[PDB]
Design a protein around this ligand. Structure first.
Ligand SMILES: Nc1ncnc2c1ncn2[C@@H]1O[C@H](COP(=O)(O)OP(=O)(O)NP(=O)(O)O)[C@@H](O)[C@H]1O
Lengths: 308, 191
């Protein structure tokens, strides 16, 4: 389900824009190369679809590739060497995770559009150059902190991204009520809105599966009754926090107590991938008076227990 | 007719030297520079230039096609002979002389043994523009763009052969292939 790519059709914050819409206006005040744009903030938030759309309001296609998805140190070279049209965009997701050097043979495409390939056997010889076209690079990171090496220099503008309010996400959801055979109401949709932890991603998950479900196609309609009904019901979860989350807490609080544990044990007692824990569950929890990371280990905030 | 020759440097000289190609001891004049970088005993190739006369035949040798080129071109002008052309060639480097000849530095020409005042001028006005395609910089090929291609490829990941084995096949379908246009086009078939 494609969407008419624009910026006027982009549900979301107006800050990065106050300092990007402006440079988006520079690609028409100077040339086509709009400084390397890195992206921060938590997942879902909207990264791809941003520039995936930015492109069209620029005049060039878009090529996007995940970082770690780079074995051959020349896979990007190939992603640079003939495949563009003097403007196309190259998006690099999970960019912070690139080969020790792969990220070094990435600076050439910074100053302008080169890709000088050092070479030598002993004693090393000269150094080869190519002719990568002029393009705009988007390299987003899910966890920038201190993993986006000095390459932050080569990147043009560094703007952050955060969660898009119950309103904004709920807002989107509305336009998402015009899909294929379903009408939902606002206030209701507001329900959904706050269960999509400030994330469009978790803002459609709920329904996507709802599709192929028995007792939901007969009552297709969805108003603030079904909204919070087949949501608190078999949509299996109250305010965001869902099954596995309850389970977590349940084990966090019941087995261990409100006491601290440490990804160490807990991730195992939860029979889970420690990384996958603190990374794909622990998140929302914390950012919602629930989970607390302590040098002693995780712990349950009161508002968790009484909450159930 | 005779343009090239291989033989020993049998014996050198002030402004000449003898090439024992075949069984014949040929005697040719050359530019001092070239002349000096010449050592009796070692084989050598010479870009020659025959020249009839009314008393005998003359041979003029040169380091490389470039030089020979100028020497002729030079002789091309009315009034300039082998001596002069030679001087000029013996004085300033070809490249610089090629430019000069094109542009018309009767000033720079004079600035050289056989320093001709008005002659440097004639020679100038006379070849202004009339000089030269591939002659502003001594033709010299760098590295085997082919291999060079590969060499890059290898260092970019691709196991050597994998890369070489398709660089060749590329030069096949397309002999003209700067490492660049060659290399890239490999990534394509190496996806
Ligand atoms: N701001 C938005 N406005 C309209 N649709 C959106 C927006 N953001 C995301 N979507 C839609 O949500 C889906 C992708 O979800 P999501 O993971 O949140 O965004 P993304 O940019 O594709 N991913 P990422 O790069 O990992 O942040 C697509 O089918 C889009 O149509």
């Amino acid at each position: 389900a494609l969407r008419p790519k624009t910026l006027d059709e982009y549900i979301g914050q107006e800050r990065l824009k106050q300092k990007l819409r402006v440079y988006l206006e520079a690609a028409k005040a100077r040339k086509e190369p709009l400084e390397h744009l890195l992206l921060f903030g938590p997942p879902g938030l909207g990264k791809t679809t941003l520039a995936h759309v930015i492109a069209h309001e620029l005049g060039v296609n878009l090529r996007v590739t995940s970082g770690p998805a780079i074995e051959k140190p020349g896979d990007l070279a190939a992603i640079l060497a003939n495949s563009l049209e003097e403007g196309d965009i190259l998006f690099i997701d999970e960019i912070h995770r690139l080969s020790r050097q792969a990220e070094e043979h990435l600076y050439p495409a910074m100053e302008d559009f080169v890709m000088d390939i050092v070479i030598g056997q002993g004693p090393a010889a000269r150094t080869i150059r190519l002719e990568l076209p002029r393009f705009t690079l988007i390299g987003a990171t899910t966890r920038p902190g201190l993993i986006t090496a000095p390459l932050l220099s080569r990147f043009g503008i560094v703007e952050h991204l955060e969660y898009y309010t119950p309103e904004e996400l709920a807002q989107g959801v509305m336009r998402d009520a015009r899909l294929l055979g379903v009408r939902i109401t606002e206030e209701a949709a507001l329900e959904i809105g706050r269960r999509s932890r400030g994330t469009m991603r978790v803002a459609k998950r709920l329904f996507r599966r709802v599709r192929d479900f028995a007792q939901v196609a007969g009552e297709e309609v969805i108003t603030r009754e079904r909204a919070l009904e087949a949501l608190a019901a078999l949509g299996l979860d109250e305010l965001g926090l869902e099954k596995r989350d309850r389970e977590i807490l349940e084990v966090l609080i019941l087995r261990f107590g409100g006491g601290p544990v440490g990804l160490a044990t807990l991730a195992t007692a939860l029979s889970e991938d420690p990384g996958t824990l603190e990374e794909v569950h622990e998140p929302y929890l914390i950012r919602q008076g629930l989970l607390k990371r302590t040098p002693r280990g995780r712990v349950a905030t009161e508002l968790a227990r009484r909450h159930l | 007719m005779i343009r090239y020759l291989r033989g020993l440097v049998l014996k050198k000289e002030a402004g000449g030297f003898v090439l024992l190609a075949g069984g014949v001891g040929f005697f040719l004049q050359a530019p001092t520079p070239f002349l000096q970088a010449l050592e009796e005993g070692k084989e050598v190739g010479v870009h020659t230039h025959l020249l009839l006369k009314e008393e005998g035949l003359s041979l003029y040798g040169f380091p490389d096609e470039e030089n020979l080129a100028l020497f002729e071109l030079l002789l091309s002008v009315s009034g300039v002979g082998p001596k002069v052309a030679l001087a000029l060639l013996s004085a300033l480097p070809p490249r610089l002389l090629a430019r000069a000849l094109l542009e018309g530095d009767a000033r720079l020409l004079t600035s050289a043994s056989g320093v001709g005042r008005r002659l440097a001028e004639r020679i100038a006005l006379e070849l202004k523009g009339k000089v030269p395609p591939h002659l502003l910089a001594g033709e010299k090929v760098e590295s085997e763009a082919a291999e060079e291609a590969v060499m890059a490829l290898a260092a970019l990941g691709f196991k050597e052969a994998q890369a070489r084995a398709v660089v060749l096949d590329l030069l096949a379908q397309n002999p003209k292939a700067r490492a660049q246009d060659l290399i890239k086009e490999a990534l394509k078939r190496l996806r």
